[PDB]
Ligand binder design. Structure first.
Ligand SMILES: Cc1ncsc1-c1ccc(CNC(=O)[C@H]2C[C@@H](O)CN(c3ccccn3)C2=O)cc1
Ligand SMILES: [Cl-]
Lengths: 88, 104, 146
């Protein structure tokens, strides 16, 4: 299937499935007009967890099975909240 | 059953899924379709052990317990550069800041 | 609108907690008001006595975060066929990343210190809007009419 590249502020490149990245409305808008998106304020320890959320969301949404918890370490919680708010 | 992985090399990470019964070679075919390098120019690792092409991903230790959507397992990747393989180098992610005073 | 029907027809139900949270079962009485029932530790099941048409919802016992029961928000026991109880599988929903983040920041910061966090103003309001059974019932009655 199709893939996109999401670059963090510290230069890490995250290659994720396009369908998975379209979980975020902001990423969908960035790909509709002006397959790479650069995030000047999201560091790699936050953006790697954002990509883990997309696969978690796509795998478990609408599934009739036991849903596991999405874990978030206390050290990243506030920056991940800021990134999730920007990405929707 | 499906296993969820992070194929990592230098500063690039591929988030992908595969079957537990699928082989290390079939995972190199997935990497080929993304980074345009053939399986013969690839070496996949787990921690520091090189993985043999004919083994299943379950036989390497990537199962529903270690490779989850919300907690994916890492597969190291090293490409062939002129008849010789480079040393496995995975750059780590940034360190989070100090835990705020109100969160401590 | 959302209330239990006083059918007086017994129905045996298995409350099966398939979530990592301590679950608070909540029964909506004949006036639509929520009543708390004993809590279920994670991964436990209880065979309970209920009635047909009775309306139940399930929340996290500590934070009141919303939970699903048989993939939906409300559970109504039906007739027991072939001497079998009705299963009410309580599971975590797939929360939005923002909601899960709000859940973790709320579990670590006292509400009086939300304003001390260096975050945008709208995020203070989001943190303060704690999960509330009364609010979600209003949202569900409005969508039940529409
Ligand atoms: C072990 C456990 N763990 C979690 S929850 C629970 C439990 C314990 C005990 C009962 C027993 N049934 C009732 O208490 C209700 C069920 C309701 O559907 C109707 N109702 C009621 C009462 C007063 C007027 C009208 N109806 C009742 O008797 C149930 C769950
Ligand atoms: Cl029981």
């Amino acid at each position: 299937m199709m893939y996109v590249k999401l670059i963090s502020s510290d230069g890490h490149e995250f290659i994720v499935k396009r369908e998975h990245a379209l979980t975020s409305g902001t990423i969908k808008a960035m790909l509709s007009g002006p397959n790479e998106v650069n995030f000047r304020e999201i560091p790699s320890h936050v953006l790697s967890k954002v990509c883990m959320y997309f696969t978690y969301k796509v795998r478990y949404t609408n599934s009739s099975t036991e849903i596991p918890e999405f874990p978030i370490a206390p050290e990243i919680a506030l920056e991940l909240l800021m990134a999730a708010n920007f990405l929707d | 059953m499906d296993v969820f992985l992070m194929i990592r090399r230098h500063k690039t990470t591929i988030f992908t899924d595969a079957k537990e019964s699928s082989t290390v070679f079939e995972l190199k075919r997935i990497v080929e379709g993304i980074l345009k390098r053939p399986p013969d120019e690839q070496r996949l690792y787990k921690d520091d052990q090189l993985l043999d092409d004919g083994k299943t991903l379950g036989e390497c230790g990537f199962t529903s317990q270690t490779a989850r959507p919300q907690a994916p397992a890492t597969v190291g990747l090293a490409f062939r550069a002129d008849d010789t393989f480079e040393a496995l180098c995975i750059e780590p992610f940034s360190s989070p800041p100090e835990l705020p005073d109100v969160m401590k | 609108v959302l209330r239990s029907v006083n059918s007086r027809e017994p129905s045996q139900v298995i409350f099966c907690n398939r979530s990592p949270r301590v679950v608070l079962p909540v029964w909506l009485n004949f006036d639509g008001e929520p009543q708390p029932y004993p809590t279920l530790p994670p991964g436990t099941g209880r065979r309970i006595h209920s009635y047909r048409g009775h309306l139940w919802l399930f929340r996290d016992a500590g934070t009141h975060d919303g939970l699903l029961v048989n993939q939906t928000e409300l559970f109504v026991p039906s007739l027991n066929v072939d001497g079998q109880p009705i299963f009410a599988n309580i599971t975590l929903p797939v929360y939005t990343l923002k909601e899960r983040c709000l859940q973790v920041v709320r579990s670590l910061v006292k509400p009086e210190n939300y304003r001390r966090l260096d975050i945008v103003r709208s995020l203070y309001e989001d943190l303060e809007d704690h999960p509330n059974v009364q609010k979600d019932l209003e949202r569900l009655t409005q969508e039940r009419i529409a």
